Amino acid sequence: CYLSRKLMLDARENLKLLDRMNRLSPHSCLQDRKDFGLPQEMVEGDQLQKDQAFPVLYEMLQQSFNLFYTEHSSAAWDTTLLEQLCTGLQQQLDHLDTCRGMDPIVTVKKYFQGIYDYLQEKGYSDCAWEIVRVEMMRALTVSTTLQKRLTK
């Protein structure tokens, strides 16, 4: 796709924004353990067809955007980083769509459902969110490695 390189630059910039916001997080929440069962497997061995890679990456990003959009819907009044991250994720989704013309996808949807359920069971607390954003650094990292495969 003519946006291959642009897509990798979108990913790198979203990862940068998410890392910076996590590092500036005003909370000293406890690193107290937590596992979200991210199917890292997908891109760790490239165990999927290209026609399967694309829909899985698109789902990862759409869900990532929905989640940060929801965080934004309730974050502090001027969290400019969160806004930029949402904007950068939407931009990446738009580029992937320009490039356009279920089991693994279901596995992604379950992973993200476990995220919302965790947020729900914690009443969307400030620390429930810091924990989820650190997990999101993992989800965005694996989806970036997958995007590379579709690219390279």
UniProtKB/Swiss-Prot annotation:
The keyword Cell cycle does not apply. Constitutively and exclusively expressed in the mononuclear cells of the extraembryonic trophectoderm. GO terms for molecular function: cytokine activity; cytokine receptor binding; hormone activity. The keyword Signal applies. GO terms for biological process: defense response to virus; female pregnancy. Disulfide bonds join C1-C99, C29-C127. Keywords: Antiviral defense, Cytokine, Disulfide bond, Hormone, Pregnancy, Secreted, Signal. GO terms for cellular component: extracellular space. It is found in: Secreted. IFN-tau genes are intronless. They evolved from IFN-omega genes in the ruminantia suborder and have continued to duplicate independently in different lineages of the ruminantia. They code for proteins very similar in sequence but with different biological potency and pattern of expression. Belongs to the alpha/beta interferon family. IFN-alphaII subfamily. Paracrine hormone primarily responsible for maternal recognition of pregnancy. Interacts with endometrial receptors, probably type I interferon receptors, and blocks estrogen receptor expression, preventing the estrogen-induced increase in oxytocin receptor expression in the endometrium. This results in the suppression of the pulsatile endometrial release of the luteolytic hormone prostaglandin F2-alpha, hindering the regression of the corpus luteum (luteolysis) and therefore a return to ovarian cyclicity. This is Interferon tau-1. It comes from Ovis aries. The gene is IFNT1. The chain holds residues 24 to 187 of 195 of the full protein.
